[PDB]
Amino acid sequence: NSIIGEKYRWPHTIPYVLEDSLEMNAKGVILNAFERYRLKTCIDFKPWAGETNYISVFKGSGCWSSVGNRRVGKQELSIGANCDRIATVQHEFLHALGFWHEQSRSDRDDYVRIMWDRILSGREHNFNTYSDDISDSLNVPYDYTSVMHYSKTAFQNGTEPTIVTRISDFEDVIGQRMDFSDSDLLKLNQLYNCSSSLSFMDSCSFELENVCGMIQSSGDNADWQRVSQVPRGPESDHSNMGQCQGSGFFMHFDSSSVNVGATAVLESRTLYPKRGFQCLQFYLYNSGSESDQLNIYIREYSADNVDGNLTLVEEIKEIPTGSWQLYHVTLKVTKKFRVVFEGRKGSGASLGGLSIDDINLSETRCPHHIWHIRNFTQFIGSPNGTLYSPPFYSSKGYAFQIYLNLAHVTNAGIYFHLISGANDDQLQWPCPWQQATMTLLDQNPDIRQRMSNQRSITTDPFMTTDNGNYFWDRPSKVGTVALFSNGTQFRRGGGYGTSAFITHERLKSRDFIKGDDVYILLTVEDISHLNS
Amino acid sequence: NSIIGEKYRWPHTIPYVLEDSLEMNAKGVILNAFERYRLKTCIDFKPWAGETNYISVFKGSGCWSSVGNRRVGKQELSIGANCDRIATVQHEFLHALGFWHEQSRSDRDDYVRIMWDRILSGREHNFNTYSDDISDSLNVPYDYTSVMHYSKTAFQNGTEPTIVTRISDFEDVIGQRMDFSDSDLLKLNQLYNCSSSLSFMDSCSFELENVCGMIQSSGDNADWQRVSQVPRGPESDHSNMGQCQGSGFFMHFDSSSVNVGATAVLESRTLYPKRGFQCLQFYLYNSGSESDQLNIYIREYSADNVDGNLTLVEEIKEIPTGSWQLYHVTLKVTKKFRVVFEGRKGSGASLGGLSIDDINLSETRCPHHIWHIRNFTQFIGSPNGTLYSPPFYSSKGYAFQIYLNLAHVTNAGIYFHLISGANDDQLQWPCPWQQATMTLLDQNPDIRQRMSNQRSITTDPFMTTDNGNYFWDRPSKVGTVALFSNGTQFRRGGGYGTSAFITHERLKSRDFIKGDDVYILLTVEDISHLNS
Amino acid sequence: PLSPLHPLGCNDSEVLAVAGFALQNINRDQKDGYMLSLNRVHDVREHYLFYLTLDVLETDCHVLSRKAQKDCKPRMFYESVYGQCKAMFHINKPRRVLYLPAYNCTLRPVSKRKTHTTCPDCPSPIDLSNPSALEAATESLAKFNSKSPSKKYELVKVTKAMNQWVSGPAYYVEYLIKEAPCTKSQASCSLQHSDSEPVGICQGSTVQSSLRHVPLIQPVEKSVTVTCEFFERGSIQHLPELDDEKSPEEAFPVQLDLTTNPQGDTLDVSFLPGDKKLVVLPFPGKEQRSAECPGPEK
Amino acid sequence: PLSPLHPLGCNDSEVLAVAGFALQNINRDQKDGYMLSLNRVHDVREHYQEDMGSLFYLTLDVLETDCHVLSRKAQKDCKPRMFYESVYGQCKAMFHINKPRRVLYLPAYNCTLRPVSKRKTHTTCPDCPSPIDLSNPSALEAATESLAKFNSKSPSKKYELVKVTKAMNQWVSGPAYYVEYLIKEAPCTKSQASCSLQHSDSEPVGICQGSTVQSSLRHVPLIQPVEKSVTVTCEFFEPRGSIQHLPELDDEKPESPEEAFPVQLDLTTNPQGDTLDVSFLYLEPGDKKLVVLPFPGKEQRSAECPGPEKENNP
Ligand SMILES: *[C@@H]1O[C@H](CO)[C@@H](O[C@@H]2O[C@H](CO)[C@@H](O[C@@H]3O[C@H](CO[C@H]4O[C@H](CO[C@H]5O[C@H](CO)[C@@H](O)[C@H](O)[C@@H]5O[C@H]5O[C@H](CO)[C@@H](O)[C@H](O)[C@@H]5O)[C@@H](O)[C@H](O[C@H]5O[C@H](CO)[C@@H](O)[C@H](O)[C@@H]5O[C@H]5O[C@H](CO)[C@@H](O)[C@H](O)[C@@H]5O)[C@@H]4O)[C@@H](O)[C@H](O[C@H]4O[C@H](CO)[C@@H](O)[C@H](O)[C@@H]4O[C@H]4O[C@H](CO)[C@@H](O)[C@H](O)[C@@H]4O[C@H]4O[C@H](CO)[C@@H](O)[C@H](O[C@H]5O[C@H](CO)[C@@H](O)[C@H](O)[C@H]5O)[C@@H]4O)[C@@H]3O)[C@H](O)[C@H]2NC(C)=O)[C@H](O)[C@H]1NC(C)=O
Ligand SMILES: *[C@@H]1O[C@H](CO[C@@H]2O[C@@H](C)[C@@H](O)[C@@H](O)[C@@H]2O)[C@@H](O[C@@H]2O[C@H](CO)[C@@H](O[C@@H]3O[C@H](CO[C@H]4O[C@H](CO)[C@@H](O)[C@H](O)[C@@H]4O)[C@@H](O)[C@H](O[C@H]4O[C@H](CO)[C@@H](O)[C@H](O)[C@@H]4O)[C@@H]3O)[C@H](O)[C@H]2NC(C)=O)[C@H](O[C@@H]2O[C@@H](C)[C@@H](O)[C@@H](O)[C@@H]2O)[C@H]1NC(C)=O
Ligand SMILES: *[C@@H]1O[C@H](CO)[C@@H](O[C@@H]2O[C@H](CO)[C@@H](O)[C@H](O)[C@H]2NC(C)=O)[C@H](O[C@@H]2O[C@@H](C)[C@@H](O)[C@@H](O)[C@@H]2O)[C@H]1NC(C)=O
Ligand SMILES: *[C@@H]1O[C@H](CO[C@@H]2O[C@@H](C)[C@@H](O)[C@@H](O)[C@@H]2O)[C@@H](O[C@@H]2O[C@H](CO)[C@@H](O)[C@H](O)[C@H]2NC(C)=O)[C@H](O)[C@H]1NC(C)=O
Ligand SMILES: *[C@@H]1O[C@H](CO[C@@H]2O[C@@H](C)[C@@H](O)[C@@H](O)[C@@H]2O)[C@@H](O[C@@H]2O[C@H](CO)[C@@H](O)[C@H](O)[C@H]2NC(C)=O)[C@H](O)[C@H]1NC(C)=O
Ligand SMILES: *[C@@H]1O[C@H](CO[C@@H]2O[C@@H](C)[C@@H](O)[C@@H](O)[C@@H]2O)[C@@H](O)[C@H](O[C@@H]2O[C@@H](C)[C@@H](O)[C@@H](O)[C@@H]2O)[C@H]1NC(C)=O
Ligand code: NA
Ligand code: NA
Ligand SMILES: [Zn+2]
Ligand SMILES: [Zn+2]
């Protein structure tokens, strides 16, 4: 898989240029791909400032790259039309770092079979195999789930698969373009001696007695307890549900047996931010009343006061009861800090308490909005799987709504719709360069192990429809009348996304669907500044 | 924990000198410690050949080392009297690599409490704490199980603990000296950018559908199947038993439904040896008759024949039925090779088959002998916990027997006894410099995650007893009459080992006791060549 | 020995300028294909007439475009076409006359195996007679003709063809276009004798993927692009790829001999009425070359 | 300047030889403790008076060795102490030497030594043994336990303990004490035999290095497990001023103003000077006056006199 030679290695922080030829959506997508590298690898990207060799992104004839550092000088990397997929970018950058395709391994013939007669005439070289003389597999077994593996249909001349995996269960698995596989990182971080990443800070699932070094101080009246179940709720932790009950722990704040006003605190260990922006996330179960609350503080340690500056960052009230809920808190800490979790019994008859599990902290930007879809399994493949998201407001006052279509026998589609909002009389029409990213969260306990499915579209203010109208014009001009959940009419502008966001088999894989719930993490941002 | 500064780093392959002052046992123990480093880290040790700075192990006042590469030239490390324990050497070498003690972290006060009045007068500096600007904890939480953490009794003036861990459950956990903790390696490999090790080759527990890249060719008549249970046996896999049943998978060869002579093969992926000696180990369950067998082959790939040189290395017959058994195969492969597992139905009425799980392959030396103790839990703390091992022969014809004493309320002790053997009329008496290593295997699925407890004694031919007799003289001269399992009398020479091999709480921790079975891996070797 | 052809340097001011003029006449003699570019002079001889051998690289301008060498960038590495061109050109300096009686070229496309080991996802060229390349050419020409409100253009031939996988089939063709016969209500059509001669060249593409599209309100099948650029004694032979195994054989064996006789022959250059003759000799071989003539690769 | 003492270099062949002779007399004047070693000369002043009136007023930088002053061993056979147990400081001394009359004499000396900071030795070596109080009951116990072992091996001689000279502690796997102590010859034969020549009393006859390790590891079978692990080794022996020992340097101070080793060596406070009657100077009954002056101050260094360290820790 990897090319052999110390000359085909890039410096850990790669100099890049994002040439104007690139699409606005492409420029945007590329940067989000750089963030997946920063979060999961020791590879970083810095804008070129005179370094002899550097990668040069650009709308070329497709999407491609040379394998490894060719020490040419300006090394080109195409992101032409239909390349502004994130995992396409993560894939063409893995070529640049020194990787060939998965099916180009020396051992490949024992795992997959190449149906040579079904390939397009003259396209044989796209199915090359490299001997361990120039290709090092780095002692990792053959990976079907690789982000560098072709799909069963690559270069097909007809409706028949050119790459038949010898084991039948993996014939559709090959070709995934959601995120890096666990083996993809295993080889990359081995190749580049990656011991630490830029964005990763902490992951806590409480499956160990030392509970990630979380202390509790002199926990007032009550404290948090590492339990594997609470009689009223939940029956199990969040990290392992239909897998194992007791084999899986979480922290619990029993509010049923304490007085009104009683608080219990759980303080993390010292964390050292290296960016100044963080996303603290976690799953909360409420078993008591809606009156109980979970406040969050940040204890920042300045040199003037060695006892910290406790600052209330977010207060979580009215937690829905009898279900684990995903919460995202936006931080902006610059000094060594601790995260303080404070459960607080409200003035309401509680028969349980607050349960917390699967805590992740990264130096990433929180989603602007989240769509929690409950009772998910039955919508897949059903003609009534036409889900519409709650209405949301962009950071620029643009109202929107997401459409999830799961009626197709095989694929699932997502669409971005603008809608009439309160600020419409003050907004710029047509909608200029707002990039909407929709991500289907892989609900894995570890954030370093999530292969969440991400798509982005950028509102082009010059796009027209068959009637000569602007596609992203004011929804009250070019839009169709739709109903809100309360029956109030609204105007919904045209949808725009993809018919193949995820296959139904991929959606049913990994943890995208946990506890029959699904989460669509939404970020709409003005990327107009990327050109000039 | 780690010292801050690029200058306090050693080159990955550290030059060492094992000074003549060292004990024979100590010299032997040091080299076994170097092997734990080679197996679990990217740190290597090479005999000094003129390199400016180098470690120099010598018999000094007890056990000590400087923290990090002091760039002095000859840097001293002392392994004196009573420092000949493998984890003591692994500990003093972690100081040399740049680590302070665990309780010397900046955060230590939140996890442990130092009872200053209970410490010996003037021994305050042994409980130092280092500021985050001189010591880097490398973003790893506080580790009680660290091989660099003092015990609760370190420097005590009385019977009261000087280090009281704030959480009561871990007050005895602190101080372990069995092997590196998972956090000990996490920080070391981060510090030294360790991406790969010298000895690690493969670990397969079959908990994934790709089964570690194990292919089966055109498996004649039958194939091995990834199952989580077999009706006749076993009820579960070996990797997970009392925790989760159906979560753990394993390969199975159903012999009950095939005819006599039928074979099923499971061929590993290509492995690349970098040493020329290997230990292939695995757990085998027999559910069919004693007639079925599991032959092992090595398919070595030479450049002259690209189809390999298949060679039968070991044939496993008469497998005990209804229990998982640990097996060790000694290899000596120099070229890129595959391990071929062949189950074969014998001529006997079988109602199950052969089950295989927890396969590990390292470039280490197999134990010379193994002691499998069944129904273990009841012997611990019982006055009838005086276990005697089966008789064994050293590589030099010296007969011996191991003694496990578990009658003490708190500690477990192991003793090495020489006994009368068939070669006694031809051996050198007293027994000259035979190093006996006894290891209590931590039965973890991954060999990189085992903290097995290891002790070594070297027969000193000059050691005398109160009667003026040589301790390691011929057992028929200085020995007591003992009985074999069959009631035949034999002579047993004096025992020699330790009263505190492992605490009963540590023995009941990790996986030393899996399926109520315990394994004592034995290696007796002539180390006479180490002095000059 | 005779040796009238004196071996000269390759980076010489007179040798580098004459090679440029020789390449201009070779490109002007071609009526099919793409123009060449001077990378370096492999060897040069001088007789009083120059018998030079030059290493060339194909550019992105068709020979019918007649564009300047400054406005013609070379082809990308995945689609490169390079080779050697043996040529003879006599430059009469006192009479201000430049002529090239004969030339011969041999080019080879870059090995598709080498371009996929160095760039796995790169587009690689396909046969010009590929049905899918022909389809991509018509589909793209239909788009340009749908934009044209009074001029319609027919397809002449596919000049360059390529394929890759964006997320499904992707074809990249280049083709010559002719002004379709005047199909209007006028019986005269202004006596338009705009025959089968090409009027320009068009670059087109097709991408057939199942990703990024509008709503169900009108999803489009393929993604088409088209761009059109309008125009205003010897041969170039094309040999197949050089993938053969992993130096003995002549990479580009060219044969340019005016006369097989070692004494030579006279060429009546009457176009320079004056009785002007030109001394000729057989093709200069290896060994009698100057050490200062390997050629600086541009 | 009007200074009769000329500022001389520190690497001079003469200043390096006379400092050695001065260190020999300082070690010979001490009746308790361990001998010192010349690391480097901090400062050197030579008063070249007529008839060889060399009043060398030198400031020396010294390091304690492993030989007791009673052993009277050569400087060649005395290795310096390890880094975890080092004792170093300054020794201001005045030395008279008459080359034509073959005379060497040290009229006065004063020393100031400090043990190495126990905090610094545990940041640089956490598991290293660090010294303890000589009056520590556990050090005294280790000294008697080790002396009992040596006396159990002795088949006709018995030795008493005089005093603990060096004491140390560390953790091997339980308590570990490393003491050094002086031994005297026990009263001859208790109350048996003629016991002639009993004048061997109250004076140390040698020094013994001992140790105790009390751990719960590597031992014989239940047939006779030992309690402590004892070692003992014995080595037998065959002007106005003092060496003052100050406490540890900077364990309370996290680190220049204070004199690290403040030494006061002034023969006369008067700036004119005084005469020292050296009447024991060779055959000469008279003409014995030695010219003296107050302690040389700072800022008059030779620039080429910091002192090249002959014994560096790195
Ligand atoms: C059925 O169903 C349906 C569906 O569901 C429904 O519907 C719904 O309804 C509702 C009602 O009913 C509604 O609501 C609403 O909404 C709206 C909207 O929202 C959005 O927007 C906004 C705005 O935005 C904008 O702005 C900003 C600022 O500037 C920016 O940033 C952005 O970007 C934008 O911008 C744009 O625009 C503008 C104009 O406008 C322009 O200029 C520019 O250029 C651009 O273009 C926003 O803000 C929002 O957000 C917010 O909120 C949220 C929640 O809510 C959140 O999330 C976020 O964060 C934010 O925050 C907030 O909050 C906080 C607290 O919480 C605070 O603190 C802060 O501050 C903020 O505020 C979104 O996005 C809105 O607006 C509204 O509200 C309003 O109104 C009300 C009534 O009236 C009231 O109450 C309130 O208060 C408000 O008011 C205010 O505001 C306004 C606006 O802004 C103004 O105008 C006024 O004046 C006022 O102000 C005042 O106050 C404030 C506070 O509050 C302050 O801030 C201020 O100050 C400032 O300003 C001033 C002015 O005047 C000046 O002077 C000074 O200087 C300064 O400082 C003052 O003081 C409401 O909320 C909705 O919408 C609907 N939906 C849809 C879809 O449509 C129905 O209903 C049913 N039905 C049945 C029958 O059933
Ligand atoms: C092992 O433990 C012994 C007992 O330790 C004591 O008790 C435990 C529970 C803890 O609280 C310890 O911290 C505590 O020390 C150690 O012995 C003790 O050593 C200290 C000196 O380190 C000594 O302290 C002195 O005490 C006198 C007063 O003592 C009289 O009165 C008490 C009762 O009121 C009685 O118990 C005594 O026998 C006496 O009758 C006091 O005047 C001294 O004060 C001076 O010093 C302090 C600074 O320390 C200063 O602030 C003052 O202003 C003042 O000048 C001083 O505090 C204890 O008395 C002694 N306890 C006993 C019972 O002996 C033991 O130390 C070792 O033995 C010592 C005898 C001594 O030789 C030490 O050098 C030895 O290290 C300790 N260590 C070891 C290795 O065994
Ligand atoms: C230019 O290269 C051509 C290929 O090497 C030469 O033509 C070849 O000549 C052979 C006889 O010498 C004959 O068997 C080959 O079939 C023929 N090949 C081709 C493709 O024509 C060519 O020779 C002359 O010039 C060309 C342009 C034609 O007019 C030929 O008929 C001529 O023989 C070489 N040109 C010169 C000037 O040498
Ligand atoms: C999708 O949504 C509705 C739900 O209807 C019911 O639940 C379905 C799971 C199924 O069991 C239906 O038969 C139930 O009626 C369905 O819409 C109905 O369709 C029928 C005709 O098929 C029509 O007469 C009803 O009026 C519709 N509405 C209701 C509420 O009954 C739809 O058929 C469902 N489709 C599937 C496959 O789930
Ligand atoms: C250790 O081994 C034997 C086993 O004896 C039986 O099993 C024990 C678990 C316990 O239940 C005993 O009471 C059973 O008798 C024991 O040795 C016996 O000791 C008794 C006196 O206590 C004596 O009269 C018998 O003759 C012994 N032998 C037998 C076979 O009974 C021993 O007491 C056991 N000790 C423990 C604590 O397990
Ligand atoms: C990016 O801008 C390129 C030129 O910059 C323009 O002028 C400067 C001064 C500034 O105002 C800037 O904002 C302007 O965009 C431009 O070449 C490129 O355009 C794209 O490609 C050309 C050939 C056209 O097809 C055009 O419609 C395209 O948008 C700009 N890129 C994008 C993605 O907008
Ligand atoms: Na959990
Ligand atoms: Na398993
Ligand atoms: Zn690729
Ligand atoms: Zn230590």
Short mmCIF file of C-alpha atoms and ligand atoms in Angstrom, two decimals, chain A residues 378 381-385, ligand 4:
data_model
loop_
_atom_site.label_atom_id
_atom_site.label_comp_id
_atom_site.label_asym_id
_atom_site.label_seq_id
_atom_site.Cartn_x
_atom_site.Cartn_y
_atom_site.Cartn_z
CA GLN A 378 -38.53 1.82 10.13
CA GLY A 381 -36.50 1.61 2.41
CA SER A 382 -40.10 2.71 3.15
CA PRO A 383 -42.08 4.94 0.76
CA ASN A 384 -43.01 7.10 3.82
CA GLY A 385 -39.34 7.80 4.63
C1 LIG E 4 -46.45 4.93 5.16
O1 LIG E 4 -47.29 5.72 6.03
C2 LIG E 4 -48.72 5.45 6.13
C3 LIG E 4 -48.97 4.73 7.45
O2 LIG E 4 -50.08 3.82 7.35
C4 LIG E 4 -50.08 2.65 8.16
O3 LIG E 4 -48.79 2.13 8.51
C5 LIG E 4 -48.04 1.42 7.50
C6 LIG E 4 -46.75 0.96 8.16
C7 LIG E 4 -48.88 0.30 6.89
O4 LIG E 4 -49.12 -0.78 7.80
C8 LIG E 4 -50.20 0.86 6.37
O5 LIG E 4 -51.00 -0.19 5.82
C9 LIG E 4 -50.96 1.58 7.49
O6 LIG E 4 -52.19 2.13 7.00
C10 LIG E 4 -49.30 4.70 4.92
O7 LIG E 4 -50.29 5.49 4.27
C11 LIG E 4 -51.56 4.88 4.15
O8 LIG E 4 -51.67 4.18 2.90
C12 LIG E 4 -52.93 3.53 2.69
C13 LIG E 4 -52.82 2.79 1.38
O9 LIG E 4 -51.70 1.90 1.38
C14 LIG E 4 -54.04 4.58 2.73
O10 LIG E 4 -55.31 3.97 2.50
C15 LIG E 4 -54.03 5.30 4.08
O11 LIG E 4 -55.04 6.30 4.12
C16 LIG E 4 -52.66 5.92 4.37
N1 LIG E 4 -52.63 6.54 5.69
C17 LIG E 4 -52.77 5.90 6.88
C18 LIG E 4 -52.39 6.70 8.10
O12 LIG E 4 -53.19 4.75 6.97
C19 LIG E 4 -48.27 4.13 3.94
O13 LIG E 4 -48.87 3.09 3.18
C20 LIG E 4 -47.06 3.60 4.71
N2 LIG E 4 -46.24 2.75 3.86
C21 LIG E 4 -45.37 1.83 4.34
C22 LIG E 4 -44.95 0.76 3.39
O14 LIG E 4 -44.96 1.87 5.50
#
